[PDB]
Predict the structure of LD10117p.
Amino acid sequence: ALRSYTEIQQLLQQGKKRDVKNILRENSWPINSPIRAQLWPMLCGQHLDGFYWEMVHQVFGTTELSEKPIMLPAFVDATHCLPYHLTSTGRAVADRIVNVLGYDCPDITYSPVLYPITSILLHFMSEEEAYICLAGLVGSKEKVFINQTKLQHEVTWKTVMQIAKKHTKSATSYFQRICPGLKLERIFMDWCWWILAGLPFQHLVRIMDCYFHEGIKVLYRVALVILNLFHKECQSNNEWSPDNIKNDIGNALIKFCKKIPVSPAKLLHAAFSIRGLSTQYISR
Ligand SMILES: O=P(O)(O)O[C@@H]1[C@H](O)[C@H](O)[C@@H](OP(=O)(O)O)[C@H](OP(=O)(O)O)[C@H]1O
């Protein structure tokens, strides 16, 4: 039997965050489960009743959703406004949310992650609830969820690079070998896109479950796992032989993720097996 929303909400009010953290890690609620409509707005909230629509009005002058394609704020990665399974109306709603966010949060200058997440939220809750999740995450003062400046963006992928150099040293050494002269920076600049634009939606959802509770470290972990799985795969295999991937390891990783050979649960099992990732270690 799987855990339920009200169970977790109780534990949360009591303050058993490790218990909640572990439930989220091990409970693989199906893709259709109604729990996320309730589970996710709470998780995001843990870190104004009609405030959203006020913002909506001030920007667009109306509550009514446009059919005209909406112009996105410059902080979005135009190449990565990943819609996933959102309908045409779903995308238009996403466009409205990020416009509102850009309007109310002027310090967000570069956040290629913000739109893909907005789309994910919209798969399980309403437009206003998605917003309130996002504003919670972005405004988090302790935990980090969504990078908002280009400086933060680059410190982050450099951090991930540093972590990968030790925890998946074989994979990175393997990259340098098959591709001499290659600077690993070019590869890790796109680390989040392995997850957000590679892994199947099914895998993303389970990842979001833990991510909305723990933060960006969950994403760090999954990045390591993908790198290990990709190196293992490269050792004996169809298309991921050195000759086909040396040309572009970058999208070789993306292609590999789209056809990732492990279940969401087996993927998540590896990530949390990884030890030593102290929060102030990654600050060093
Ligand atoms: O014991 P290990 O093997 O070193 O593993 C980590 C360690 O226990 C830290 O206390 C903790 O980091 P922080 O509490 O400082 O974030 C992290 O929690 P986590 O699994 O929730 O990330 C653990 O994974």
Observations:
- The chain has three domains: 48-146, 1-47, 147-284.
- The pocket of D-MYO-inositol-1,4,5-triphosphate is lined by residues 214, 217, 275-279 (CB under 6 Å).
